[PDB]
Amino acid sequence: MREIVHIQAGQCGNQIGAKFWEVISDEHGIDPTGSYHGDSDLQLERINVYYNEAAGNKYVPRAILVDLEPGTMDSVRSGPFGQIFRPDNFVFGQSGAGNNWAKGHYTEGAELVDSVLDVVRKESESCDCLQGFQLTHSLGGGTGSGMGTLLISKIREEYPDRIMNTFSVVPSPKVSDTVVEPYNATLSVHQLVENTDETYCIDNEALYDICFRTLKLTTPTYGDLNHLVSATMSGVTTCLRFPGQLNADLRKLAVNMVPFPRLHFFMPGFAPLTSRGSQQYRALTVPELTQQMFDAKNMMAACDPRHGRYLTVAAVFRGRMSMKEVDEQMLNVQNKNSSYFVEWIPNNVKTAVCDIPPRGLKMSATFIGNSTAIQELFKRISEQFTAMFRRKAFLHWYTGEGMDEMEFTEAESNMNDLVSEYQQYQ
Amino acid sequence: MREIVHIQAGQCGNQIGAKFWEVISDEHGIDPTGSYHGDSDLQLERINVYYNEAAGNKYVPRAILVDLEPGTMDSVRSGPFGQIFRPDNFVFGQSGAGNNWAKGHYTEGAELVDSVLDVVRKESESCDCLQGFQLTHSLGGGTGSGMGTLLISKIREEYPDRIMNTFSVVPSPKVSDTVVEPYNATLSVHQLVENTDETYCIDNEALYDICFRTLKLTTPTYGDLNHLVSATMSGVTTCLRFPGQLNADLRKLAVNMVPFPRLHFFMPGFAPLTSRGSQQYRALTVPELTQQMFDAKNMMAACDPRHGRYLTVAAVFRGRMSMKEVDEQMLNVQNKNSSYFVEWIPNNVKTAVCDIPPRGLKMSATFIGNSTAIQELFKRISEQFTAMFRRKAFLHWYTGEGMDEMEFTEAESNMNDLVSEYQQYQ
Amino acid sequence: MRECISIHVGQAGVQIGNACWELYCLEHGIQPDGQMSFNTFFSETGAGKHVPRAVFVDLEPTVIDEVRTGTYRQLFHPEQLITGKEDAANNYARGHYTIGKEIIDLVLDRIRKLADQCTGLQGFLVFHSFGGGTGSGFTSLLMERLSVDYGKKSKLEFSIYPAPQVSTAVVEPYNSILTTHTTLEHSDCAFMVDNEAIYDICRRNLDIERPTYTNLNRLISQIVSSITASLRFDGALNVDLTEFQTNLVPYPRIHFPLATYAPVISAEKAYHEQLSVAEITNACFEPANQMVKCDPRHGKYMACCLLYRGDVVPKDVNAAIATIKTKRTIQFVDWCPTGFKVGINYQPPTVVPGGDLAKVQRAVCMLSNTTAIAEAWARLDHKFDLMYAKRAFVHWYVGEGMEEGEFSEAREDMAALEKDYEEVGV
Amino acid sequence: MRECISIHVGQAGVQIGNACWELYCLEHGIQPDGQMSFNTFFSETGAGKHVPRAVFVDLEPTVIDEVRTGTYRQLFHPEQLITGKEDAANNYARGHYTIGKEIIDLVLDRIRKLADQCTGLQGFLVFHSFGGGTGSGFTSLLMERLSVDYGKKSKLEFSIYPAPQVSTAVVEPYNSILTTHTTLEHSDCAFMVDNEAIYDICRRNLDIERPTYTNLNRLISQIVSSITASLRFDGALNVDLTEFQTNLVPYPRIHFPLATYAPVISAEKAYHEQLSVAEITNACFEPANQMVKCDPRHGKYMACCLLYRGDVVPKDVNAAIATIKTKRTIQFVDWCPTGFKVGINYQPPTVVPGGDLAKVQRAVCMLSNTTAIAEAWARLDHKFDLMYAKRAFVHWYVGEGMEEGEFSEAREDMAALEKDYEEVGV
Ligand SMILES: CC(=O)O[C@H]1C(=O)[C@@]2(C)[C@H]([C@H](OC(=O)c3ccccc3)[C@]3(O)C[C@H](OC(=O)[C@H](O)[C@@H](NC(=O)c4ccccc4)c4ccccc4)C(C)=C1C3(C)C)[C@]1(OC(C)=O)CO[C@@H]1C[C@@H]2O
Ligand SMILES: CC(=O)O[C@H]1C(=O)[C@@]2(C)[C@H]([C@H](OC(=O)c3ccccc3)[C@]3(O)C[C@H](OC(=O)[C@H](O)[C@@H](NC(=O)c4ccccc4)c4ccccc4)C(C)=C1C3(C)C)[C@]1(OC(C)=O)CO[C@@H]1C[C@@H]2O
Ligand SMILES: Nc1nc2c(ncn2[C@@H]2O[C@H](COP(=O)(O)OP(=O)(O)OP(=O)(O)O)[C@@H](O)[C@H]2O)c(=O)[nH]1
Ligand SMILES: Nc1nc2c(ncn2[C@@H]2O[C@H](COP(=O)(O)OP(=O)(O)OP(=O)(O)O)[C@@H](O)[C@H]2O)c(=O)[nH]1
Ligand SMILES: Nc1nc2c(ncn2[C@@H]2O[C@H](COP(=O)(O)OP(=O)(O)O)[C@@H](O)[C@H]2O)c(=O)[nH]1
Ligand SMILES: Nc1nc2c(ncn2[C@@H]2O[C@H](COP(=O)(O)OP(=O)(O)O)[C@@H](O)[C@H]2O)c(=O)[nH]1
Ligand SMILES: [Mg+2]
Ligand SMILES: [Mg+2]
């Protein structure tokens, strides 16, 4: 039961997603030929959650690859795990998106979306029991932002009772990567607030910081950054695919992390995070892992958590460990740093546990924080957007596709309301 | 229980500390790979006091290496035992200290100190029960003096109920090693008087004298001098790490050696101290060892003890010996030289005993004297400082970093008060 | 796939195009024959050959006659190479009105035919000169026709600007203004250089004592290649022509990028040099290394795009950008904080044998819109006024269908543009 | 790491620099090509080569032309080697005002670029002459510019003093005074020699009958190496450039060290000699072995630093220092009792093949500030007065932007300096 439909939209989303699949395939003992070569029955028990089986023990991701240009997907295909995907699951155009939400959402994306939806429908029909949908995008481009938003809207209309979660790569205010970034992000978020149950917010700045400080990486590759994201993603759904002492459903996580409908933007984190060299100075305790997880240097969103408070935190631990030990340690953390934990919620954290480590570790953990601090990120984007709008800069590219000032204003109002809500529950 | 946090600051402090670790590692059967290869269960019983254990029976000093330039620490790393340290415990800058207390305490040191403090905090959190902090510095430089003083202040603010002890290498008036030495020393001591519970005062002149006269060493290396200091240091904490007939805590030693809050500057000594050749003319009795310990030639501070009186003396003996014999011998010493023992304190000495010799000796002892004579050292530094101040010599280097004449005057006043106190209890 | 069309018009453009084609051939592995995302610039035949997706026009036969006897000859298919009878005679009014309205139709038909090969016709490339007779009016006419036909499709102009000090033609000033009058309301993006700057670069960075057209053209070709390679090749953070339009056109009228390419380094100067990413970025932002006579300190960069090639890391690039932002001298516009697009391609630039440049692992093309360029426009206007006051060299133009008020209108338009720039700056 | 920059200005400086670079190459193991804390003086390329962290300036092309054809040629990267058109003409007023304010900017830019390689930019080295036209005004200008830019950074001048008796130029006296006027309020430390003393040394200690520039330069290079090696190499009791500033600058205006290097021994005289540490120290303190015409008995040493190299023991050095102190002839200042800094490096000095000096296991560089040097200053002032009384050779200076009162002001400053020295002595 509880099978998940995977969608990658736009370049970022697609490349991250490739790595995600690679990771998970390795985890479940699936080789690039789609054959299983694992050593445990636990490895196949719940393989249904991500994969479909075909004749000759072939396994196929229930994955959809979407793009408005071919190059990215061609590269994916050429790649190592690219040949595992069912070829009819590549849905793509040829006309470019110009980092333009309007092209993705209104015009070129509108032309392709129905074909995507049909494939989605088939996958849904092939499910014993559909749990939900996982999307990968950027916030700042045209495809992931415009097309991605579009797709989510249509899927929620069709499956309004199912879980909708996104791993969304967001702008980092100190190092912008595109000129229209604020426009694309604000337009996207305006619709993500309404049409997703959870969004995991990653900013590349934070990843770079992680790479430099802890992993001792002078030269991060996008591949390595994607690996980090992939690990988080895998961690999130471990308890759907494996046993445990205390188990976590996706829906249960949402319930534990969402006190109000709108506040579902999470900062993910991971542990352990060290170099090949700074590991022998450490032992692997639950305490150690928790310390790592609550270290600002191990956050993947662009905030100091101390510039705010955690409303709710979910930790998912993997490996054999004492529940007593874990709970006690978390209680100690709560006691000693009580000011960073909103007082409305007794037992500020949720813990989940999986009786199964990821290959080559004894223990691991993945962290999901919902903090009032993340308002700062929203503020920065709103300010950036606002200045450009004040001068109607770059606007002709969007007005030419039918978009109107009022819509833009609405988006800004939404953003401001979001931040106000965070302020209220500071 | 009773675990100790080790800090080395400045060049002197760092190089001495390396040797200290080397000595102690040998003592506890820890090889340069961080593995234990000892022959006794006593060797590991209290290894916690200096070391943390990691996966794969790796042991790691709870040690922090601090410097404002990289060279010294790089050399440490390159050295034999350098690879035992956890790499994240090296905290260092690149901008030099110019033998300038102001650079260490106010400016360049201020930039680095918070990062050091965070590591200190982690070590504290990793302790079952923190006993105290051990620091190694020079008095006459910029890093050990300025940065070192700074660090101590911050740690006492955070851990005001814990033991703070320093091994501080001080100037020798007959052979100054730097031009601003008096400035650096006086500025340091001004803060050490207030923020340390005990300071072991070593001057290189005395060490050289030891080397020449007793060890028959024509050519002392800094390594050998550091060894001597290291042996004292090891001796001081032996009874925290091992069994005994009558045992000594660090706190207990402080209580026994400190009649008034300010008077905590000790002259360390050691026994046996002979050559490879002048040993076969000797046997190893408690009497012999005591004779050695009270020989002026075996003192490591720049004083004639006969130019004053001992307020209190602590002797720590290692090896199997009759308590009766020891006590009797010390009583005889007291009787025969009663003029050098202040009459306020019956039983002028404390004895401690460890039922465990240091490798390759049957018996050893370490001596801690608190003498009114040491006032002379303070006098010499005060005079040296004073003359230069009279002409405001070298002062622009310090005033340029914000320091003021009044502070300097205060320092001098403190020094003079110290000496007056010693005079009072002569 | 995403695929392109090339147009080279006027002598200068044709010359540039030759070099460009050579470069392309060297890169993708194509011979002089056609023997061996390569299809953006090369359509395949039945076998062996590949045909440059190109068009070559000049009213002087002698230019294209040269092409037809050179080594690069049977690469081209004679359908493309069009020739006239009598040349444009450095006269817009012959290029647009008289001889233009005759052979333009043929060229249009050819273009249409070529398009009917492109499934994904991304757009065009036009190479000309604000300064040739052919390139000033004919180009404009062609642009107009293209707009009439397609409209939505992507259009680029590589425009050789009039160098403020150095004259070539006598009526360079009129021609340029006329071109501006007509091209401005069609071509969404124009990438511009001048020769003076290139000469300067050759003198200083390459140590070349003889400024000539071939080497200069090669430089431009390199830039072109850099611009393209995002379509032509793989890489994280890819780019589309439409993305440039979106990114570098804040207001629809202001669309005149400058260009620059670093490193510009000889055989010797490559050694005695590391060539880091940050260094390269710094070089790109240097006042002298710009490819036009325009001090970037005399204004503000509105929107900037940077197209890094070969061995590059994103984090490094980000760091470099941060550093640049930190520099207070290089001013940006108040209202656009996010004024960077990052483009990264795993293909490194490859240089043509018997040329200026040496091998460089990493390079950048930087494309920027500024308030500072307005000075050049002003200068041009002044020049136009000075010679329009006398009304000299007007009897060439009047004869081939012209009016006096047209010039005035053009001047007014220029003034308006200047005003707009000023407003933007404010 | 702690890293440095080298500047060699004027013919003399350039010549010195050549020798220095050769010495460095011989020491660290670098070829004429660049093939093989080494990074204080050599930045690495992509591969193979190493680039001297250097700058070479002279307005005479002929000096640097020589460099550009010598064996040491492709070691240097031609970015560094700058040349002028017309020389300084032994005229401060051309070096500072006229031709100085033209190419200085370029040099500054180069320096900035070089700095942008240094993570830990310790400081600079400037080699010139109180006596060249280039080296008197241009140097000053450069210093001023550096002060304006950095200020906090460490700055050194190696200054070839005018020999009291032996003339070279006709207007050596004016130039020197002008330099003093401007450099004095910027450069924190200046290390000085004269040629006469060096010649004397060559005659007596080395038995060399022919005084020439190459061998002389080599001596200076050795001194430079000795000064540096604390940064360049390991050793107990290490030294920083900032330490020199702290140690050898009592009052901010008085900062003119003398230098000396012992042993200065030929091939024969090395035998019939032991070369002990104490002996070497004694030699260093000898009246004749000083590198300037200044009797150290005619005043008092304020602050002294001694940089021992190779096989050395600290105790021995201390003993030597004690002995020196005991000697009643060698006077010290009343108010500074601690007037020694000890520097010890395990690297022994290595001498250039085809040169003056032989192998010596132990050597010293001694850097001292005294009241005795004032005599030289007085002599210089007298000289200036004698020729300013006539106002001869003034028509060179007036023409390139000068005033009569400037000279008077300079004289006043000199007088003030003399007075200060006298006060210090008292
Ligand atoms: C000798 C040893 O123990 O090596 C470790 C190791 O040194 C460290 C540093 C690993 C290493 O990870 C990285 O260096 C890294 C690189 C890019 C992106 C992210 C991380 C390791 O490469 C990663 C590798 O991770 C796994 O094997 C997990 O199963 C992990 N797998 C992958 O990400 C993966 C990589 C390539 C191909 C297929 C899968 C995983 C994590 C979560 C969910 C699923 C899988 C491990 C433990 C190690 C190495 C090998 C050095 C660390 O990472 C992980 C994900 O475990 C980095 O910090 C942790 C701590 C580990 O101790
Ligand atoms: C044949 C024999 O008995 O040799 C002795 C010896 O001859 C003498 C002279 C040793 C020797 O010590 C020295 O010569 C020395 C050198 C540098 C600095 C200080 C001392 C000895 O080297 C030192 C060595 O010391 C130890 O083994 C202790 O455990 C000591 N260890 C170290 O300092 C150490 C050295 C190298 C590597 C690792 C550790 C120790 C002392 C206190 C706390 C912990 C450890 C001993 C007894 C000897 C020799 C070997 C000759 C003496 O020193 C010590 C520390 O015991 C010097 O005076 C004593 C008296 C000893 O009898
Ligand atoms: N880069 C480059 N620029 C050129 C070249 N030839 C001419 N130009 C520039 O182009 C302008 C003159 O226009 P041309 O292209 O020669 O004229 P044309 O387009 O052939 O038009 P007509 O000759 O008048 O029919 C001037 O600004 C020249 O500097 C060349 O070979 N390379
Ligand atoms: N040690 C050393 N000193 C030199 C050398 N050449 C000149 N000097 C000294 O430098 C002073 C003359 O200055 P130069 O450096 O020759 O003059 P310059 O800096 O080249 O300036 P101009 O030639 O006037 O442009 C005199 O005091 C010389 O003794 C040399 O090769 N070695
Ligand atoms: N982690 C990661 N981020 C990316 C990658 N490619 C682009 N991005 C980020 O995604 C944003 C740009 O959107 P992008 O997906 O390229 O535009 P699209 O192709 O129109 O959807 C920027 O913030 C980039 O830093 C990638 O491969 N990995
Ligand atoms: N025992 C010992 N003393 C040292 C060593 N290095 C320096 N000293 C002494 O420390 C004092 C100088 O301070 P130093 O630590 O070098 O300056 P810093 O590096 O700025 O802290 C002088 O009294 C030196 O004799 C060493 O390696 N061992
Ligand atoms: Mg032509
Ligand atoms: Mg000269």
**Residue C132: strand pairing partners:** C130
Interface mutation vs chain B, best among D1, D232, D246, D423, most B CBs within 10 Å: D246
Give the C-alpha separation, B145 to B188, whole Å: 5
CA distances, A225 to each of A221, A222, A230 (Å) = 7, 5, 9
Contact status of D405 with chain B (Cβ, < 8 Å): no
Topology match between the domains D1-257 and D373-426: no
Element (DSSP H or E) covering residue D180: helix D172-183
Give the C-alpha separation, C360 to D149, whole Å: 32
Which residues contact residue A299 at a Cβ distance below 8 angstroms, ignoring those fewer than 6 apart? A206, A267, A269, A305, A369
How many residues appear in chain A? Answer: 426
Give the C-alpha separation, D355 to C130, whole Å: 66
Residues with CB under 6 A from ligand 5: A 10-12, 15-16, 97, 99, 138, 140-144, 169, 171, 177-178, 204, 222, 225-226; C 236-237
User: From the CB of residue B11, how many other CB atoms can be counted at a distance below 10 Å?
Assistant: 25
- For the record, the structure tokens of D327 come out as 């000697």
Give the C-alpha separation, D377 to B39, whole Å: 72
Query: What are the residue boundaries of the structural domains of chain B, listed by start?
Result: 1-259, 260-373, 374-426
Give the C-alpha separation, A357 to D326, whole Å: 74
Which residues contact residue B322 at a Cβ distance below 8 angstroms, ignoring those fewer than 6 apart? B286
- Would strands C42-44 and C2-9 be described as parallel, antiparallel, or unpaired? unpaired
Give the Cα-Cα-Cα angle D381, D387, D393 (nearest 5 degrees): 125
Q: CB distance A75–C240 less than 8 Å?
A: no
B107 in a known ligand binding site: no
CA distances, A341 to each of A177, A260, A311, A331, A425 (Å) = 34, 17, 6, 12, 11
CA distances, C124 to each of A165, C114, C153, C184, C231 (Å) = 40, 11, 8, 16, 13
How many residues appear in chain C? Answer: 426
**Residue C282: strand pairing partners:** none
- Chains touching A (at least 3 CB pairs under 8 A) are B, C
C-beta of residue C331 within 8 angstroms of C-beta of residue C301? yes
Give the C-alpha separation, D193 to D292, whole Å: 5
Element (DSSP H or E) covering residue D148: helix D139-149
- Would strands D261-262 and D362-370 be described as parallel, antiparallel, or unpaired? antiparallel
Give the C-alpha separation, D45 to D34, whole Å: 9
Q: CB distance A280–B88 less than 8 Å?
A: no
> Helix, strand or coil for residue D304?
strand
Give the C-alpha separation, B167 to B181, whole Å: 17
Q: In what order do the strands lie in the sheet with D261-262?
A: D261-262, D362-370, D301-310, D340-345
Instruction: Please check whether the domain covering A1-259 is classified as CATH 3.60.20.40.
Output: no
Give the C-alpha separation, C413 to C381, whole Å: 11
Q: CB distance A178–C119 less than 8 Å?
A: no
Q: CB distance C273–D76 less than 8 Å?
A: no
Q: In what order do the strands lie in the sheet with C340-345?
A: C261-262, C362-370, C301-310, C340-345
Question: From atom 4 of ligand 3, which residue's Cα is the shortest distance away?
Answer: C12
Which residues of D are less than 8 Å from C262 in CB distance?
none
Q: E strands along A245-303, which residues?
A: 265-271
DSSP per-residue letters across C193-249: E-HHHHHHHHHHTS--S---HHHHHHHHHHHHHHHHHHHHS--SS---HHHHHHHS-
Cα–Cα nearest to C191, from C353, C16, C314: C16
CA atoms within 13 A on the CB side of D106: 16
Give the C-alpha separation, C234 to D63, whole Å: 51
Element (DSSP H or E) covering residue C125: strand C120-127
Which residues of A are less than 8 Å from C239 in CB distance?
none
Give the C-alpha separation, B94 to B71, whole Å: 9
A226 in a known ligand binding site: yes
A150 conformational bin, left if phi > 0, alpha if psi -120 to 50, beta if neither: alpha
Phi, psi (degrees; rounded to nearest 5) at C156: -125, 145
Q: How far is CA C98 from the centre of its chain?
A: 26
Q: Which CATH superfamily is domain A374-426 in?
A: Helix hairpin bin (1.10.287.600)
In the chain, the amino acid numbered B183 is: Y
A104 CA: nearest ligand 5 atom: 20
Distance C198 CA to ligand 3 centre (A): 15
Which residues of D are less than 8 Å from C268 in CB distance?
78
Distance separating the N- and C-terminal Cα atoms of chain C = 43
C-beta of residue D316 within 8 angstroms of C-beta of residue D364? no
CATH topology of domain D258-372: 60s Ribosomal Protein L30; Chain: A; (3.30.1330)
Element (DSSP H or E) covering residue D419: helix D404-425
Give the C-alpha separation, D242 to D188, whole Å: 10
Contact status of B53 with chain A (Cβ, < 8 Å): yes
| Min Cα separation D317/chain B (Å) | 10
Q: In this structure, what DSSP letter does residue D130 have?
A: B
> Helix, strand or coil for residue B64?
strand
- Would strands D50-52 and C54-58 be described as parallel, antiparallel, or unpaired? unpaired
Chain C to chain D Cβ contacts (< 8 Å): 29
Cα–Cα nearest to D333, from D367, D286, D301, D298: D301
Q: In this structure, what DSSP letter does residue D162 have?
A: P
Cα–Cα nearest to A87, from A113, A111, A63: A63
Cα–Cα nearest to D310, from D360, D366, D241: D360
Q: Select the residue of C1, C236, C336 nearest A222 (Cβ to Cβ).
A: C236
User: Which CATH number is C373-426 given?
Assistant: 1.10.287.600
Question: From atom 50 of ligand 2, which residue's Cα is the shortest distance away?
Answer: B360
Long-range interactions of B247-252: CB distance < 8 A, separation 24+: B247/B352, B247/B353, B247/B354, B248/B314, B248/B316, B248/B350, B248/B352, B249/B2, B250/B2, B250/B4, B250/B131, B250/B132, B250/B163, B250/B165, B251/B131, B251/B163
D380 conformational bin, left if phi > 0, alpha if psi -120 to 50, beta if neither: alpha
- Would strands C301-310 and C340-345 be described as parallel, antiparallel, or unpaired? parallel
CATH number for domain B260-373, candidates 3.40.1010.10, 3.40.50.1820, 3.40.718.10, 3.30.1330.20:
3.30.1330.20
User: From the CB of residue A399, how many other CB atoms can be counted at a distance below 10 Å?
Assistant: 14
C-beta of residue A299 within 8 angstroms of C-beta of residue A313? no
Ligand in nearest proximity to the CA of B298: 2
Topology match between the domains B1-259 and B260-373: no
Query: Reduced to 3 DSSP states, what percent helix, strand and coil does chain B have, rounded to the nearest 5?
Result: 45, 20, 35
Cα–Cα nearest to C92, from C84, C103, C100, C82: C100
Which residues of B are less than 8 Å from D276 in CB distance?
none
Which residues of A are less than 8 Å from B54 in CB distance?
280-283
Element (DSSP H or E) covering residue A61: strand A58-61
Distance separating the N- and C-terminal Cα atoms of chain A = 39
Give the C-alpha separation, A87 to A116, whole Å: 13
Cα–Cα nearest to D91, from D426, D421, D403, D398: D398
Cα–Cα nearest to B136, from B166, B179, B156: B166
Phi, psi (degrees; rounded to nearest 5) at D120: -105, 85
Question: From atom 51 of ligand 2, which residue's Cα is the shortest distance away?
Answer: B276
Distance C185 CA to ligand 7 centre (A): 25
**Residue A135: strand pairing partners:** A7, A166
CA distances, A26 to each of A276, D45, D113, D279 (Å) = 21, 40, 48, 73
- For the record, the structure tokens of C240 come out as 């589309």
Give the C-alpha separation, C49 to D389, whole Å: 90
User: From the CB of residue A296, how many other CB atoms can be counted at a distance below 10 Å?
Assistant: 13
Give the C-alpha separation, C39 to C232, whole Å: 8
- For the record, the structure tokens of B74 come out as 């790089």
C-beta of residue A2 within 8 angstroms of C-beta of residue A140? no
User: From the CB of residue C356, how many other CB atoms can be counted at a distance below 10 Å?
Assistant: 21
C-beta of residue C361 within 8 angstroms of C-beta of residue D47? no
Q: Select the residue of A176, A393, A396 nearest C335 (Cβ to Cβ).
A: A393
Give the C-alpha separation, D290 to D298, whole Å: 13
Specify burial of residue C416 (Cβ count, 10 A radius: 0-12, 13-18, 19+).
Answer: exposed
Q: CB distance D116–C279 less than 8 Å?
A: yes
Query: Reduced to 3 DSSP states, what percent helix, strand and coil does chain C have, rounded to the nearest 5?
Result: 40, 15, 40
DSSP per-residue letters across B406-419: HHHHHHHHHHHHHH
CA distances, B417 to each of A419, B185, B308, B375, D202 (Å) = 60, 16, 17, 11, 56
Tokens 């050793």 found at: D235
- Chains touching C (at least 3 CB pairs under 8 A) are A, D
Treating both helix axes as pointing N-terminal to C-terminal, what angle do A71-78 and A11-27 enclose, rounded to 10 degrees? Answer: 20
B172 CA: nearest ligand 6 atom: 23
DSSP per-residue letters across C368-398: EEESTTHHHHHHHHHHHHHHHHHTTT-HHHH
C-beta of residue B231 within 8 angstroms of C-beta of residue B268? no
Q: Select the residue of A96, A212, A390 nearest C240 (Cβ to Cβ).
A: A96
A227 Cβ closer than 6 Å to some ligand 1 atom: yes
* Exposure b/e, C69-89, CB count within 10 A at least 16 = b: eeeeeebbeeebbbbbeebbb
> Helix, strand or coil for residue D122?
strand
Residue in chain B lying closest to A282 (CA): B54
Q: Select the residue of A280, A284, A291 nearest B58 (Cβ to Cβ).
A: A280
Helix segments in C29-170, DSSP class H: 61-69, 92-93, 100-115, 133, 139-149
Distance B35 CA to ligand 2 centre (A): 23
User: From the CB of residue C354, how many other CB atoms can be counted at a distance below 10 Å?
Assistant: 8
Give the C-alpha separation, C152 to C150, whole Å: 6
Phi, psi (degrees; rounded to nearest 5) at A200: -95, 115
CA distances, D73 to each of C265, D52, D284 (Å) = 19, 11, 36
Distance C125 CA to ligand 3 centre (A): 17
Contact status of D153 with chain C (Cβ, < 8 Å): no
Q: Which residues precede a break in chain C, with C-to-N distance above 2.5 Å?
A: 36
Chain B to chain D Cβ contacts (< 8 Å): 126
Cα–Cα nearest to C126, from C10, C237, C9: C9
Which residues contact residue B41 at a Cβ distance below 8 angstroms, ignoring those fewer than 6 apart? none
Give the C-alpha separation, D275 to B76, whole Å: 31
Helix segments in C250-373, DSSP class H: 277-284, 314-326
- For the record, the structure tokens of A159 come out as 């499956």
Q: E strands along A319-419, which residues?
A: 349-354, 364-371
- Would strands D156-160 and D189-193 be described as parallel, antiparallel, or unpaired? parallel
Q: How far is CA A377 from the centre of its chain?
A: 17
Give the C-alpha separation, A28 to B158, whole Å: 49
Q: Is the CA virtual torsion B302, B308, B313, B316 positive or negative?
A: positive
Element (DSSP H or E) covering residue B58: strand B58-61
Integer-rounded Cα Rg, in Å, for chain C is: 21
Treating both helix axes as pointing N-terminal to C-terminal, what angle do A108-125 and A148-158 enclose, rounded to 10 degrees? Answer: 40
C-beta of residue A78 within 8 angstroms of C-beta of residue A86? no
- For the record, the structure tokens of B107 come out as 């400016």
Neighbours of ion ligand 8 (CB under 5 A): D 11, 60
Distance B234 CA to ligand 2 centre (A): 13
Tokens 């480590």 found at: A357
C-beta of residue A208 within 8 angstroms of C-beta of residue A220? yes
Query: What are the residue boundaries of the structural domains of chain C, listed by start?
Result: 1-257, 258-372, 373-426
Which residues contact residue D382 at a Cβ distance below 8 angstroms, ignoring those fewer than 6 apart? none
In the chain, the amino acid numbered C70 is: G
- For the record, the structure tokens of C8 come out as 């080279």
C-beta of residue B380 within 8 angstroms of C-beta of residue B301? no
Which residues of D are less than 8 Å from B391 in CB distance?
335, 424
Phi, psi (degrees; rounded to nearest 5) at B178: -135, 165
User: From the CB of residue C198, how many other CB atoms can be counted at a distance below 10 Å?
Assistant: 21
CATH classification (class only), C1-257: alpha beta
Residue D243 a catalytic site member:
yes
* Exposure b/e, C3-22, CB count within 10 A at least 16 = b: bbbbbbbbbbbbbbbbbbbb
DSSP per-residue letters across C341-367: EEEEESSPP-PPSSSS----SEEEEEE
- For the record, the structure tokens of C182 come out as 């007509």
C11 CA: nearest ligand 3 atom: 20
Do chains A and B touch by CB distance (3+ pairs < 8 Å)? yes
